[PDB]
Structure formats: C-alpha cells, structure tokens
Amino acid sequence: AMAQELTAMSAWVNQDGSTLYINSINAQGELTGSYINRAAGFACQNSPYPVNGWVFGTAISFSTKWLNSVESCNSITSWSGFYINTGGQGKISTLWQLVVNGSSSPSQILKGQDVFSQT
Amino acid sequence: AMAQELTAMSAWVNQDGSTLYINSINAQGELTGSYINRAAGFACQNSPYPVNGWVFGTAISFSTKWLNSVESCNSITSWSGFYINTGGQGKISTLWQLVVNGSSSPSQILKGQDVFSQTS
Numbered sequence: 001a002m003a004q005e006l007t008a009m010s011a012w013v014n015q016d017g018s019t020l021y022i023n024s025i026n027a028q029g030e031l032t033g034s035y036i037n038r039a040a041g042f043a044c045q046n047s048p049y050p051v052n053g054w055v056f057g058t059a060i061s062f063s064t065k066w067l068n069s070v071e072s073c074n075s076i077t078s079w080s081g082f083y084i085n086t087g088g089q090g091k092i093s094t095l096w097q098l099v100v101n102g103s104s105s106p107s108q109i110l111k112g113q114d115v116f117s118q119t
Numbered sequence: 120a121m122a123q124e125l126t127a128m129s130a131w132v133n134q135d136g137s138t139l140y141i142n143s144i145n146a147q148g149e150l151t152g153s154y155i156n157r158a159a160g161f162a163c164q165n166s167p168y169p170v171n172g173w174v175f176g177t178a179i180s181f182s183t184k185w186l187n188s189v190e191s192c193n194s195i196t197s198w199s200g201f202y203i204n205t206g207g208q209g210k211i212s213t214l215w216q217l218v219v220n221g222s223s224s225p226s227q228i229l230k231g232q233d234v235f236s237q238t239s
C-alpha cells in the first residue's frame with residue numbers, strides 16, 4: 001500500500017488536531033483549500049477558514065486569513081514546509097508565522113512549528 | 120502627500136532593491152501580484168515571479184513561487200508582516216521564510232527580515 005502524497009484533494013491533521021484540506025492545485029501550482037483550527041491557546045476554533053498558497057515539488061506554502069461568517073481573529077497565518085514520507089505515513093513538516101492586524105513591531109509576529117500527517 | 124496604503128495596484132521596494140507589485144486585492148482581501156528579486160546572494164534576480172496572499176486591515180501575507188519561463192530556483196518564499204504609516208509614507212515590515220523543494224529538515228528553511236517602502 002501507499003502513503004498519501006502531496007496532491008490536490010488531500011487532507012492533513014497536525015499534532016494539535018487541526019486539519020488542512022487541500023482542494024485544488026492549478027497548473028501553476030497555486031493551491032486552494034480550507035483549514036479548521038483545533039489548537040488550544042488560539043481562538044477561531046472548529047469552523048472553516050480559507051486557504052491559498054503554492055506547491056513546488058515537495059515544497060509547500062499555505063496561508064489562512066482568520067475571517068469567516070462566524071468568527072474573526074483579525075490575523076493571518078502562513079506556513080512554509082515540505083512533504084516527507086516516513087514511518088508509513090505522508091506528512092508535511094512546517095514552520096509558521098502569525099501576524100495580527102494593527103501590529104507595530106516584528107516582535108509581535110508569533111512563530112511555531114506544526115507537523116501534519118495524512119488522514 | 121498622504122501615504123500609499125495596502126491597495127490594489129501598489130508597488131513597494133525593499134532594502135535590497137526588490138519590488139513587490141500588488142496587482143489585485145478582492146473584497147475578501149485575497150491578493151495577487153508579482154515580485155522582482157534584486158538581493159545579492161540569491162538567484163532568480165531581475166525577472167517577475169507570481170505572488171498570492173491575504174490582506175486583513177494592516178496585516179498582510181504574501182508568497183512567491185520561484186518558477187517562471189526565465190529561471191527556476193526550486194523554492195517558495197512566504198512573507199508575514201504589517202503596514203505602517205510613518206507620516207505620509209507607507210511601509211510594510213515583514214519576516215520571511217524560504218523553503219526548498221526536496222528539504223528534509225526545518226533547519227533548512229531560511230529566514231530573514233524585509234522592510235518595503237512605497238514607490239512610484
């Protein structure tokens with residue numbers, strides 16, 4: 001059998017239970033999808049947010065604007081990462097940055113690390 | 120002379136001479152544009168690369184995929200940052216991350232700071 005690959009129509013869950021749904025990848029490599037945050041310490045949980053970004057081989061970037069019809073967090077997250085297949089599972093290993101509307105210093109940009117696994 | 124703000128059809132130049140062209144921002148804040156890199160120590164200079172991203176008030180993210188018909192650098196840069204009005208002059212202060220096709224460790228993701236200023 002086969003580990004999940006980095007393709008259109010693929011779903012990925014990180015260590016905190018948040019899910020990335022990659023829905024389309026166009027011929028240029030532009031991606032669209034949605035994201036559901038389930039990580040404690042952050043608001044905008046349990047509802048879908050829009051995603052765009054890029055794929056280039058095993059490299060990927062994706063970014064979510066935290067506004068939908070139910071809750072706004074006045075912020076944007078961007079992830080930079082790469083696909084690997086280890087331990088029988090496809091994964092996307094990422095570093096992310098979160099910027100809040102109204103910031104005045106780069107010290108206010110929050111940073112973290114997420115590893116997303118297939119399924 | 121009031122500041123250029125985060126609007127469609129705005130151009131911005133960083134401390135290395137690279138230019139961000141924001142071409143469109145739709146009513147949801149989704150952005151498209153193009154980017155010309157002029158930073159010493161990096162390839163893929165002096166040709167336009169495609170950009171997408173998001174605007175949210177003064178917060179902005181944008182990302183460039185380093186492939187066009189002239190040169191490929193097998194990589195993607197993502198910027199996160201915020202707009203500031205310094206008194207008639209607009210700037211975007213950012214932190215960036217660059218990830219390369221075929222990477223196997225987060226230590227291989229490059230990081231830096233860029234500040235862009237409004238330009239004609």
Ligand SMILES: O=C(O)CCCC[C@@H]1SC[C@@H]2NC(=O)N[C@@H]21
Binds near residue numbers: 019039043096098
């Ligand atoms: O609180 C906010 O400003 C919006 C929610 C942010 C959730 C962040 S995005 C990076 C990290 N990965 C997640 O799945 N959740 C957090």
Ligand SMILES: O=C(O)CCCC[C@@H]1SC[C@@H]2NC(=O)N[C@@H]21
Binds near residue numbers: 193231
């Ligand atoms: O070398 C590459 O992989 C492609 C070009 C990368 C240029 C980077 S993007 C971040 C920083 N800011 C710039 O204007 N140039 C560099």
